[PDB]
C-alpha cells in the first residue's frame, strides 16, 4: 500500500516517530527493519541499537560486572563467605541478558500487532524514488523486492555502525556487536578506543575474565575519554588501573595477525606487540547510509558521511528527513527519541519544533561511572572571559571501610564567573549517572552557582557535594588557567 | 582575690551539626572568639552524642554505614541472576566486625574535629554540661545534675542553644527493659528477635539493618500505632515500602502500640500491646519520636520560652524571647535534619555577626529514607498540595526496573511522582522510591528553588538508561485534584 509515513529503521528515533504519527495523529505508518529480534546476523533489530546491542544490554552487563566489587567490598562490612568458591559465569549473564532483550523484542512486536495504522515490515529499506521505498530480501540492491511502499514523507532512521579501521588483519577483530555474543569470556582482551564503549566493555571483560586473565585498553592519544572533564579522564584512568585494567595510551594497532591457536598477535605503530584472545575495535561509530541508495534521489551527506539536515531534520530532498545517529550530531538514544518526536510535531502537528543539542546530560557506565551535562572548562574558557571551577574530590567514607580506597568521588561545577551561570557539571563516582539527570533540568532554568549552594543538602549522599561549594578552586581568565 | 572568666563573642552549647557550623563560621569568617561545649569528646556510652553531634556519632553517619552493610544481603543474593556463583552456605553477617568498623570511622571524625579545634585560633572546645546561669553567663558543670561542680564560668555576649533532641521513651510499665537508637549502635551481638517501635525513618531504617545481620532463625518486627508507616511521606510510597519490607521478611504490625514490657526469666522481653496481643523479642528498640533536649540547660534561670510542644520558641531568624540568646537545629522542633541545622547555624551567624541577615527556608527541603530500597523526596505530598491549590496535577510512573527482573527482586518497584500546581505547571513536590532515590533527589531540590515547571522536566533530555530519566519522560497527568477531589478532568 501507500502511507503517510514510511520509516526506515525500527530504532530509537524511528519507533518513536512512527508511534506518535499513528497514535497522536491517526496516520497510516510503515516501519521497516532487517530483523525482528536481537543478535547475529544483523545484531540491531526491532527496537534499534540501544535495545538490542547498546544501552539496554550493556547496562545489565555492567550491573553484572559491579558484583565483582560488591563481593569484595562486602568483607569490610563484616560479610564472610568462601572467597575461593567465587566464579563469574559469563554464559549465565549472556543467557539472562538474551532473555531480557528478547522479551523487549516480542513486546515491541506485540505493540505493532495491536496498533492499527502502524505496520512493521521485515527487510532492507532503500530509496527507489522521491516517494517510493523499496524493501528487498537483503542489503544487496540487486536483490528481490518484497515491497514498494508509497509515502508522503520518508524518515531515514537507520542509525550507525562500528568504524573498523582498514588496517591489515581488521577482519580478525570484533566490534561491540560481537562482544554481546561471545560464548566464552576472553582471558586476554584488547579494547581499542579511548571512548565510552571501549571503557565500558573493558570494565565488563575485567569482571568476567577467567583466572590469570588481563584486560588491556589502548588509545592512540595521551588520555582516554576525550570530550570529558579532564580531572575525571585522569581519575577514571587511575581507578580502572586500580581495578586491574591496563591502559595503553599513545598506542595504535597497525596490524592484527591470526595465530593458529585462534589468538591474535597485535602489532602497534610503535612496533610494540601484544597477544590477546579478542581484539574489540571501538574507535568510533559511523552513520549507516550505505545500503539506502541515497544516490537514487540525490540526498546529500556531509564531509563526515552523515545525512545533512537542517535544525528541523529536513534533508535537501522535500518530504525526506533524517534523525538519530544517521545524522552524526549526538549519538544518544534520548536525543534520537526527542528528534523523532519533534519531527512528527513539525510535520503532522501544528507547532514546528526543533531538538536542542546543548546542555544534554549523558553518562559513561564505567566502573566507577561518569555523569555529565554542559561544557568542560577548556571549552568554557574559550567562549567566556572569566570562568570559575568548583571542585570537590574525596574518597567517600563507605570506601574507607570497603577497602576500595582508590574510589574518589569527583564533583565539578564550571561557571561563567561574571554572572555565576552554571556552564557544566561533571561527576565521577557511584550514582553519578542518576545525580546528573535533574542537573540537566537546572541548566535549562539558567541555574547559577548560588542556586546550587543555597539549596539544602540531602545527607549523607555524594550528590550534596553539589550544594556545598561556594568558593572556586581556580579560574580561567582570558583562556588562562589560574589560582586567583 | 578574684580573676577573669574566659570571655567570648559567642558561646555555643552543643557541638553538633548546627552548633559546629555556627561556631566555625563566627570564628573563621568573622574573627569572633567562640566557645563550644559538649558532654563528650568522642562517640559512645555513657552519653552517646559527643563532639560532632548526633549525626556524626549516633545518627546519619554510622547509620548509613550500617545500612550500606545491610545492603550486601541483597547484593550477594541478587548477583546470582548475573551469573555470580559462590558457596551460599558459607555466608555469614558478622555484626561485630561491622560495629568495630563503624566505631573506628566515627572515632576518626571525632579525632579530626578535635584537631580542627586545636588548630583554629578563636575556636575553643569545653568538655561538660552547659547551662544558662544568666543572660550572659554560661556555666559548664561536671554532670547534667545542676548541683554538680562548676568546671568553668564563661562570659558570653551571645549564647546559642544547639543541644539537639533525644529519643522519646513512653511512660509504660517496663520501659526500662527497652532501648533507643542510641544503644542499637553498640549492641555486642546482633539481636535474634527485635521489635522496632515506631513508623518513622529511624524505626524503618534500623528494621532493615537488624534484618540483614540477625542470626539464624531470627525475625525483625516493626510496629506502628497507626494504620500506615511513614506519615508525612507520599502515600503510594508508604504502601510500597511496607510491601517491600514485607517481601524482604520484616513483619509490620500496624494499629499496635506497646502498653508494657516485662523481662522473661531467660532475659528476653515479653511485650504486651494495647490490643491484648503479645510478642517476645530479645531487643525492644523504641523509636517513636525525638524530643527537644531542653531539660539540662536551666532555661528558667533566664526565662527563655518554650513552645506548647517543648521546643525553644524562636522567630524566623532563630531568636528566642531573650536578647542575644538564639536556638537552631532539633532543639527548635521544626525539621530534624542535619543540613537544616547547618543551614540555620550559617544563617544565624550571618545575621548576628555578618552583614547578611538571612533566614532559613524550611520549605522544599530534600530528604531521604535509607530503607532498602531507599526514598528520596522534596516538597509537598499531593494531599497537602490539594488543600492549598485549586488544581493539582499528579504524574506517576511505577514499574519493576529490568535489572530487578534479572536479579530476582521483582517486588522492587521503582515509584516516581511529580505533584504540580496545574494552573501554571509549577512543581510542588517530587517523590521517589527505588535504588539511588536519595542521589536523584538532590538536584531536584535545586529545580524546585528555581520554581521549575513540569514542562522544564519533560523538556529536558533523559540520561538513558537511568531511573532518574522517568522524571523527564512524563507529560500527561495520571490524575488530578480539583478543589480537594481526586479524578481525571
Ligand atoms: C555498545 C553501545 C552502547 C550504547 N549506550 C548508550 C547509552 O548508554 N545511552 C545512550 O543514550 N545511547 C547509547 N548508545 C547509542 C544509542 O544506541 C544510539 O544512539 C541510538 O540507538 C540511535 O538510535 P537511531 O534511532 O538513530 O538508530 P537505532 O536505534 O540504531 O536504529 C536503527 C535501525 O535501523 C535498522 N536498519 C539499518 N539499515 C536498515 C535498512 N537499510 N532498512 C531497514 N532497517 C535498517 C537497524 O536494524 C536498526 O534497528 C549506545 C550505542 C552502542 C553501540
Ligand atoms: C538514628 C538517627 C539517624 C539520623 N539520620 C539522619 C540522616 O540520614 N539525615 C539527616 O539529615 N538527619 C538525620 N538524623 C538527624 C540529625 O542527626 C539531627 O537532625 C541533627 O544532628 C540535629 O543537629 P543539632 O545541631 O540540632 O544537634 P546535634 O547534632 O544532636 O548536637 C547536639 C549536641 O549537644 C550535646 N549536648 C546536649 N546537651 C548538652 C549540654 N547541656 N551541654 C553541652 N552539650 C550538650 C549533645 O552531646 C550533642 O553532641 C538522624 C538522627 C538519628 C537519631
Ligand atoms: C512511545 C514509544 N516510544 C518508543 C521509542 C523508542 C523505542 Cl526503541 C520504542 C518505543 C515504544 C514503541 C514500541 C513499539 C512501537 C513503537 C514505539 N513506545 C511505545 C510505549 N507506549 C506504549 O506501548 C503504550 C501502551 C499503551 C499506551 O501506551
Ligand atoms: C565548616 C564545618 N561545618 C561543620 C558542620 C557540622 C559539623 Cl558536625 C562539623 C562541621 C566542621 C567543624 C569541625 C570542627 C569544629 C567546627 C566545625 N566544619 C569545618 C570543616 N573543616 C573545614 O572546613 C577545614 C578544616 C581545615 C581546613 O578547612
Ligand atoms: Cl563462563
Ligand atoms: Cl584509538
Ligand atoms: Cl589527549
Ligand atoms: Cl565508539
Ligand atoms: Cl549509577
Ligand atoms: Cl556477629
Ligand atoms: Cl508508635
Ligand atoms: Cl495513618
Ligand atoms: Cl524517632
Ligand atoms: Na547548600
Ligand atoms: Na524529556
| Ligand 3 center to A483 CA (angstroms) | 51
DSSP label of A34: S
User: Is B445 an 8 Å CB contact of chain A?
Assistant: yes
Peptide bond into B264 cis (omega under 30): no
* Any domain includes B481: no
| The three grid cell numbers given for residue B485, joined into one nine-digit string | 477531589
Return the residue whose CA atom lies nearest to atom 23 of ligand 1. Answer: A12
- Specify whether the CB–CB gap between A156 and A319 falls below 8 A: no
Which CA distances in Å does B286 have to A97, B26, B168, B206, B261?
A: 45, 37, 8, 11, 12
- Specify whether the CB–CB gap between B112 and B279 falls below 8 A: no
b/e map B77-92, b = 16+ CB within 10 Å: ebbbbbbbebeeeebe
Could you tell me which of A266, A286, A268 has the C-alpha nearest to residue A327?
A: A286
Residues of B carrying an active site annotation: 464
Which CA distances in Å does B484 have to A233, B232, B382, B420, B476?
A: 52, 18, 10, 14, 20
Q: Helix crossing, A196-208 with A230-242: angle to 10°?
A: 20
Residues B220 and B317 in one domain: no
**How many whole angstroms separate alpha carbon A346 and alpha carbon B81?**
44
Residues contacting ligand 1 via CB (< 6 Å): A 8-14, 32-34, 42, 44-45, 48-50, 54-55, 58, 124-125, 157-159, 176, 197, 288, 291-292, 324-326, 331-334, 336; B 464
Angle made by CA atoms B201, B472, B204, in degrees to the nearest 5? 10
Other Cβ atoms closer than 10 A to B357: 11
DSSP label of A35: -
Q: Which residues of chain A lie closer than 8 angstroms to B367, CB-CB?
A: 458
* Any domain includes B489: no
- Nearest CB neighbour to B105, from listed A71, A400, A439: A400
- Specify whether the CB–CB gap between B44 and B107 falls below 8 A: no
Q: How many residues does chain A have?
A: 484
* A297: CB partners within 8 A, 6+ apart: A127, A129, A130, A317, A320
User: Is A19 an 8 Å CB contact of chain B?
Assistant: no
Angle made by CA atoms B249, B252, B255, in degrees to the nearest 5? 170
* Any domain includes B485: no
Sign of the Cα pseudo-torsion (B14, B19, B20, B23, in order): negative
Binding-face residues of A in 64-83 toward B, CB within 8 A: 64, 67, 70-71, 73-74, 76-82
**Chain A residue with minimum CA distance to B406:** A96
Domain end residue (candidates: B288, B320, B352): B288
Beta bridge partners, A178, equal none
Expt. technique: X-ray
Q: Which residues of chain A lie closer than 8 angstroms to B101, CB-CB?
A: 76-78, 401
* Any domain includes B152: yes
Task: Test A436 with B467 for CB contact under 8 angstroms.
Answer: no
**How many whole angstroms separate alpha carbon B189 and alpha carbon A427?**
39
**How many whole angstroms separate alpha carbon B16 and alpha carbon B43?**
12
Sequence positions preceding breaks in chain A, C–N over 2.5 Å = none
Which CA distances in Å does B72 have to A55, A57, B341?
A: 26, 24, 31
Q: What is the dihedral of CA A120, A356, B458, A23, to 10 degrees?
A: -20
**How many whole angstroms separate alpha carbon B412 and alpha carbon B355?**
50
Residues A270 and A310 in one domain: no
What's the domain count of chain A? 3
Residues A259 and A291 in one domain: no
* B142: CB partners within 8 A, 6+ apart: B128, B129, B148, B149, B150, B151
Sequence positions preceding breaks in chain B, C–N over 2.5 Å = none
- Specify whether the CB–CB gap between A323 and A344 falls below 8 A: no
Ramachandran angles phi, psi of B180, nearest 5°: -120, -175
DSSP secondary structure string for all residues of A442-482:
HHHTT-BHHHHHHSPPPSS-SGGGGGS--S-SEEEETTEEE
Structural element, H or E, at residue A87: strand A87-88
Return the residue whose CA atom lies nearest to atom 8 of ligand 1. Answer: A55
User: Is B29 an 8 Å CB contact of chain A?
Assistant: no
* Any domain includes A481: no
DSSP label of A23: H
Residues contacting ligand 3 via CB (< 6 Å): A 12, 15-16, 19, 47-48, 51, 108, 111, 337
- Specify whether the CB–CB gap between B79 and A96 falls below 8 A: no
Distance from chain centroid for Cα B264: 33
**How many whole angstroms separate alpha carbon B15 and alpha carbon A235?**
36
Q: Which residues of chain A lie closer than 8 angstroms to B105, CB-CB?
A: 397, 400-401
Beta bridge partners, A218, equal A192, A248
- Specify whether the CB–CB gap between B37 and B14 falls below 8 A: yes
Residues of A carrying an active site annotation: 459
Peptide bond into A460 cis (omega under 30): yes
Closest ligand 2 atom to Cα of B131: 41
* Any domain includes B484: no
Q: Helix crossing, B201-213 with B235-247: angle to 10°?
A: 20
**How many whole angstroms separate alpha carbon B63 and alpha carbon A78?**
15
Return the residue whose CA atom lies nearest to atom 5 of ligand 3. Answer: A16
Beta bridge partners, A6, equal A30, A154
Structural element, H or E, at residue A184: none
Residues B280 and B325 in one domain: no
- Specify whether the CB–CB gap between B278 and B272 falls below 8 A: yes
Nearest-Cα distance to chain A for B406, in Å, is: 7
**How many whole angstroms separate alpha carbon A226 and alpha carbon A221?**
9
**3-state secondary structure labels for all residues of chain B:** CCCCCCEEEEEEECCCHHHHHHHHHHHHHHCCCEEEEECCCCCECCCECCCCHHHHHHCHHHHHHHHHHHHHHHHHHHHHHHCEECCHHHCEECHHHHHHHHHHHHHHHHHHHHHHHHHCCCEEEEECEEEEEECCEEEEECCCCCCCCEEEEEEEEEEEECCCEEECCCCCCCHHHCECHHHHCCCCCCCCEEEEECCCHHHHHHHHHHHHHCCCCCEEEEEECCCCCCCCCCHHHHHHHHHHHHHCCCEEEECCCEEEEEECCCCCEEEEECCCCEEEECEEEECCCEEECCCCCCHHHCCCCECCCCCECCCCCCECCCCCEEECHHHHCCCCCHHHHHHHHHHHHHHHCCCCCCCCCCCCCEEEECCCCCEEEEECCHHHHCCCCCEEEEEEEEECCHHHHHHCCCCCCEEEEEEEECCCCEEEEEEEECCCHHHHHHHHHHHHHCCCEHHHHHHCCCCCCCCHHHHHCCCCCCEEEECCEEECC
Beta bridge partners, B260, equal B272
Residues with CB under 5 Å of ion ligand 6 are A 219-220, 283
Sign of the Cα pseudo-torsion (A401, A402, A404, A407, in order): negative
Task: Test B464 with A398 for CB contact under 8 angstroms.
Answer: no
Structural element, H or E, at residue A406: none
- Resolution (angstroms) stands at 2.1
Domain end residue (candidates: A326, A358, A390): A358
Residues A174 and A82 in one domain: no
Task: Test B472 with A70 for CB contact under 8 angstroms.
Answer: no
Nearest-Cα distance to chain B for A205, in Å, is: 14
Task: Test B406 with A59 for CB contact under 8 angstroms.
Answer: no
| The three grid cell numbers given for residue B477, joined into one nine-digit string | 497527568
Q: Which residues of chain A lie closer than 8 angstroms to B403, CB-CB?
A: 59-60, 63
Residues B121 and B185 in one domain: no
Residues B221 and B118 in one domain: no
Domain end residue (candidates: B288, B317, B341): B288
**How many whole angstroms separate alpha carbon B444 and alpha carbon B402?**
24
CATH number of the domain residue A339 falls in: 3.50.50.60
User: Is A431 an 8 Å CB contact of chain B?
Assistant: yes
Binding-face residues of B in 337-396 toward A, CB within 8 A: 337-340, 342-343, 361, 365-368, 376
**How many whole angstroms separate alpha carbon A55 and alpha carbon A183?**
20
Half-sphere exposure at residue A22, Cβ-oriented, CA atoms within 13 angstroms = 24
Residues A15 and A126 in one domain: yes
Tell me the three state secondary structure of residue A231: helix
Distance from chain centroid for Cα B133: 31
- Specify whether the CB–CB gap between B150 and B140 falls below 8 A: yes
Q: Which domain holds residue B436?
A: 364-475
Return the residue whose CA atom lies nearest to atom 17 of ligand 3. Answer: A15
Binding-face residues of A in 158-197 toward B, CB within 8 A: none
**How many whole angstroms separate alpha carbon B327 and alpha carbon B344?**
9
Residues B11 and B144 in one domain: yes
**How many whole angstroms separate alpha carbon A347 and alpha carbon A334?**
20
CATH number of the domain residue B380 falls in: 3.30.390.30
Q: Which residues of chain B lie closer than 8 angstroms to A361, CB-CB?
A: 460-463
Residues A15 and A113 in one domain: yes
| The three grid cell numbers given for residue A309, joined into one nine-digit string | 539536515
* Any domain includes A483: no
- Top residue of B57, B461, B470 to mutate, by most chain A CBs within 10 Å, is B461
Beta bridge partners, A151, equal A3
Could you tell me which of A351, A357, A469, A337 has the C-alpha nearest to residue A412?
A: A469
- Specify whether the CB–CB gap between B320 and B159 falls below 8 A: no
Residues A313 and A249 in one domain: no
Instruction: Looking at A75-139, list the stretches that DSSP marks H as alpha helix, in order from N- to C-terminal side.
Output: 90-114
Residues B334 and B358 in one domain: yes
| The three grid cell numbers given for residue B315, joined into one nine-digit string | 522567630
Amino acid at each position: 500500500k501507500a502511507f503517510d509515513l514510511v520509516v526506515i529503521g525500527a530504532g530509537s528515533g524511528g519507533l518513536e516517530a512512527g508511534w506518535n504519527a499513528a497514535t497522536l495523529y491517526g496516520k497510516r505508518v510503515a516501519v521497516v527493519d532487517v530483523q525482528t529480534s536481537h543478535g547475529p546476523p544483523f545484531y540491531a533489530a526491532l527496537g534499534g541499537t540501544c535495545v538490542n546491542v547498546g544501552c539496554v544490554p550493556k547496562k545489565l552487563m555492567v550491573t553484572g560486572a559491579q558484583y565483582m566489587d560488591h563481593l569484595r567490598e562486602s568483607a569490610g562490612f563484616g560479610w564472610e563467605f568462601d572467597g575461593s568458591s567465587v566464579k563469574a559465569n559469563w554464559k549465565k549473564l549472556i543467557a539472562a541478558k538474551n532473555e531480557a532483550v528478547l522479551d523487549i523484542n516480542k513486546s515491541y512486536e506485540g505493540m505493532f500487532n495491536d496498533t492499527e495504522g502502524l505496520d512493521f515490515f521485515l527487510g532492507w529499506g532503500s530509496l527507489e524514488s522521491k516517494n517510493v521505498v523499496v524493501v528487498r530480501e537483503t542489503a544487496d540492491p540487486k536483490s528481490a523486492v518484497k515491497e514498494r511502499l508509497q509515502a508522503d514523507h520518508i524518515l531515514l532512521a537507520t542509525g550507525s555502525w562500528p568504524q573498523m579501521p582498514a588496517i591489515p588483519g581488521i577482519e580478525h577483530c570484533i566490534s561491540s556487536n560481537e562482544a554481546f555474543y561471545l560464548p566464552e569470556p576472553p582471558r586476554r582482551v584488547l579494547t581499542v578506543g579511548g571512548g565510552f564503549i571501549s571503557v565500558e566493555f573493558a570494565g565488563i571483560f575485567n569482571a568476567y575474565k577467567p583466572p590469570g586473565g588481563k584486560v588491556t585498553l589502548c588509545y592512540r592519544n595521551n588520555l582516554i575519554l576525550r570530550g570529558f572533564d579532564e580531572t575525571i579522564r585522569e581519575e577514571v584512568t587511575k581507578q580502572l588501573t586500580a581495578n586491574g585494567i591496563e591502559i595503553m595510551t599513545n598506542e595504535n594497532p597497525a596490524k592484527v595477525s591470526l595465530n593458529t591457536d585462534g589468538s591474535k598477535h597485535v602489532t602497534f605503530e610503535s612496533g610494540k606487540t601484544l597477544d590477546v584472545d579478542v581484539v574489540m575495535m571501538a574507535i568510533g561509530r559511523i552513520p549507516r547510509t550505505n545500503d539506502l541508495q541515497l544516490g537514487n534521489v540525490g540526498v546529500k551527506l556531509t564531509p563526515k558521511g552523515g545525512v545533512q539536515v537542517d535544525e528541523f531534520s529536513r534533508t535537501n530532498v522535500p518530504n525526506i528527513y533524517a534523525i538519530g545517529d544517521i545524522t552524526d550530531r549526538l549519538m544518544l538514544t534520548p536525543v534520537a527519541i526527542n528528534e523523532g518526536a519533534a519531527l512528527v510535531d513539525t510535520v503532522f502537528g501544528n507547532k514546528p519544533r526543533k531538538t536542542d543539542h546543548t546542555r544534554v546530560a549523558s553518562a559513561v557506565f564505567s566502573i566507577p561511572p561518569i555523569g555529565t551535562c554542559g561544557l568542560i572548562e577548556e571549552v568554557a574558557a574559550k567562549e567566556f572571559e572569566k570562568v570559575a571551577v568548583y571542585m570537590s574530590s574525596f574518597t567517600p567514607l563507605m570506601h574507607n571501610i570497603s577497602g576500595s580506597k582508590y574510589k574518589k568521588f569527583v564533583a565539578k561545577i564550571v561557571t561563567n564567573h561574571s554572572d555565576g551561570t552554571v556552564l557544566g557539571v561533571h561527576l565521577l563516582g557511584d550514582g553519578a549517572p542518576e545525580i546528573i539527570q535533574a542537573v540537566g533540568v537546572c541548566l535549562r532554568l539558567n541555574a547559577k552557582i548560588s542556586d546550587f549552594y543555597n539549596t539544602i543538602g540531602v545527607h549523607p549522599t555524594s550528590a550534596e557535594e553539589l550544594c556545598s561549594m561556594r568558593t572556586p578552586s581556580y579560574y580561567y581568565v582570558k583562556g588562562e588557567k589560574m589560582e586567583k
